Design a protein around this ligand. Sequence first.
Ligand SMILES: Cc1cn([C@H]2C[C@H](OP(=O)(O)O)[C@@H](COP(=O)(O)O)O2)c(=O)[nH]c1=O
Ligand SMILES: [Ca+2]
Length: 130
Amino acid sequence: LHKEPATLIKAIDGDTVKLMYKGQPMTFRLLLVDTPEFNEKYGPEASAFEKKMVENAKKIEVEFDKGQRTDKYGRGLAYIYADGKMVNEALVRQGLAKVAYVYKGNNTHEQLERKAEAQAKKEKLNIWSE
Ligand SMILES: Cc1cn([C@H]2C[C@H](OP(=O)(O)O)[C@@H](COP(=O)(O)O)O2)c(=O)[nH]c1=O
Ligand SMILES: [Ca+2]
C-alpha cells in the first residue's frame, strides 16, 4: 500500500474525519472499525480520541487499501495515520472501536486490527470492560 499526504479540515466523530485530499474536501470513514455514535456509551470518548490524534499531528497521511475507495454515502475508505501512527489501530487497541466492516477487497490490516482488539478485550478496556 502507500501513504499519501493530506491536511486536516475537521474531526467529525470516532471513526470519520474530514480532510483536504488532492485539493478537495473529503469525508473519510476509517476502514475496519466501528466506533459508538457520539450519543452512545463511549461515543464521546471515541470522538475525543480521534480528534486529539488528528489535531495534534503535524503529518496526516491517507492509505487506501487495494479495493473500493469510496462507500455508498460518498465517503473515502482508508487507513489514516497521524504522525506515523494508524488511527484505525489505535482506536481498537484502546477499546474505543470494534473490528467491523471487514470486506475482503479491503482487508490488508485485518490481522493487525484483530490483534489490537484481542488485547483491549484482555485488558477489559472501555467497550470490553463488561
Ligand atoms: C467502514 C465501511 C463502511 N461502509 C458502509 C457500511 C454501512 O452501510 P449501511 O449503514 O447502509 O449498512 C455504513 C456504516 O457507516 P457508519 O458506521 O459510519 O454508520 O457504511 C462501507 O460500505 N464500507 C466500509 O468499508
Ligand atoms: Ca460508527
